[model samples]
Target: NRPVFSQDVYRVRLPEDLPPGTTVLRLKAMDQDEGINAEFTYSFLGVANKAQFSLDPITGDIVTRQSLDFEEVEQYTIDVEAKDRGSLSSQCKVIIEVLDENDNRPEIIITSLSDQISEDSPSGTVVALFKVRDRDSGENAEVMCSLSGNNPFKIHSSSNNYYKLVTDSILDREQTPGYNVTITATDRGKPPLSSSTTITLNVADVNDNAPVFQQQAYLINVAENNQPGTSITQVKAWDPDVGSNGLVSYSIIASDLEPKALSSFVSVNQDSGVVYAQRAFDHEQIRSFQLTLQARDQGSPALSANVSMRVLVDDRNDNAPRVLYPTLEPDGSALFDMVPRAAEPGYLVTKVVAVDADSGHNAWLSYHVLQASDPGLFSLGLRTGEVRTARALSDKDAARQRLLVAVRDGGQPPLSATATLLLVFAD
Candidate 1:
């Protein structure tokens, strides 16, 4: 009888995946005939995974040569054949499927992100949007996203494998100008492989910080009669913010002077904060005046601060002393008062009265006897300018004595005025 196959088409099922260097399945074939020499051999007529599966010609065994992946090839349809030595043949098929395993790590990609964001942006502001992916199926593809700590940012899942980077707390450019964030994506695989990417975000400046002056109050000294446009002093301020937020402009806000408006006497450079006198100052009119200055930033919404500065005007010897007392005669010459020759040595003489318009030491007046007939006979009070006899009249004194007195001001190079006195013996 002719040899017949065990079954028409043999169906062998296998897992979708197998490890490398392992046997997948052993193929068998049988042929029945009368003679004892009726032995069979096995071989592959056509196989899907030729590089992975091989068959033994004599033993009819099929084994895996290398690893098989379901993602690459889901199933292998192997066409097997058997032949007897007497020339009888049979054929069958084997189906090999590669089973899946957790083998792929998570991958991260930045979809969109703004490189710069304003510090004034509200919380929950979006910084970036990214995606994650894993080649493995099932739990291995499920990813959880997170960000590095110690920053004012957090990650939230928007959709599957999609995440958003957002502000978790308030942001201040003055405190922290920029941030480097590391976004990590981890899968739920058995080993839990993860991937990460770094993102740089720069914080833009806003008018959140006000300009701060170097000091709360400033004291400046300017001598009176100074040239107009003279630089009195400079006001300085700084802002921690950048760009327009840090740009400072100066202005005179208020003043305690009679003119009320500081602009009347002073002007300031808008950019440098250098102050200039609009006109010469008179210490007699304004000894010291307070100026309220303001420093402002050039931001969309401006911020400013105020500082008070006291500017003192110093005096100079600009005025001369004028004699007030000892009325002059019709001819503009000093009038001599008659004194008795028998008068005591300490007898009082006419008082020399003078006044100076200047203040301080410049206004202090002193009197001296620059020229006198008898130098030892008279003395003068330095402060009171009162002239009195220094010694009693003597027989040797002339019947008509003439005396001269000089009055001087306390100015650096003093100015002087002269007066004369006459004395006669009583009849």
Candidate 2:
């Protein structure tokens, strides 16, 4: 009474892609009773996924009819039978599972975004919010978000499927006024599937920078007799901010002189920053003075900067020298001075005094002995304007000598004056 078949029922598991005509399983049967009763035939009872799989009745072999996908149908079943010629039979079943493969890509969507942001905004400020989606299930559906390049923005996970784009550092509109960031969403699928989108971020301006002057300090020279409306050098400054934050105006700040007095001397153009003289300058009264200038922006709270400059009023040869001593005659023609006949060389006969109203180099004066009564007997000091004997005077020297001394100023194309002097020698 031994078993007639290898087993009562058989079970098998196979992947979906068994080639057509490929043997999946073989059925056999045996009998302890004699020859004729041991003979058997194998056949298939039924099969599932018929369009995608098939079974041979004569051989009891299962095969695939076409390609199969786990996403469509995960499993299939097959039934087979082995029968003895005498009509006894055994049956078994086969199960097939279709394994999963990565096939789908991730999707990206922008939910909310801003058109522009101010550069003064702090870090961690949200710029945009988005979602990442994948149609696949399990690990293949897992996704992550990232940004390309070294931008000041980064991605943060707000939820499993949602993300936020925020600033990671301070924004400087002057350095990088705009941003074009490519946001990428990638799935964990094998040979990862990814999607990306570009976002434009415009950085607005703020009054973060103060006005800057081109130079540390400025200096200018104005001739004493300059016209009232003469244009002096212009003051310039730059602000990195845009629009009203960068619009600069100029003003003259009060310093040495009273506000009213300084305003009378010079004026500044509010829009152009060009400085102008208000009236003719006199170096004798004011040689040089300090001026404080201010540059201000037009922002809400307004930003400003100040610079100092030296305004030097240069002198012109406007005044001539006036002689004082050895008192001139009422007619102002001749000057009389007495000298001893025994005077030695280098003796100071008399000192000439002169005065000038101008200041600086233009006021500098020198004396020259022009048409001296006796060139060898007398000389004039170039710097001191004093008269002295060039040689010892003897009795043979004339009792009286007349000389003309010229005084010239140190101006370009100098102006001059002559003084007539008469010297009476006595033993």
**Candidate that scores best on TM-score:** 1
Put down candidate 2 lDDT per residue, 133-224, tens digits, no spaces: 88676787899888999889989997679999999899999999999999988888777888899988999998999999888899998888
Model 1: colliding residue pairs: 15-97, 16-97, 16-98, 16-99, 17-98, 17-99
Q: TM-score, each model?
A: 0.80, 0.73
Candidate 1, residue 369: Cα displacement in angstroms equals 0.9
Model 2: residues >4 Å from true position, as ranges?
A: 1-100, 334-350, 372-403, 422-427
C-alpha local distance difference test of each model: 0.77, 0.78
* Number of clashing pairs per prediction, in order: 6, 0
lDDT of 1 at 53: 80
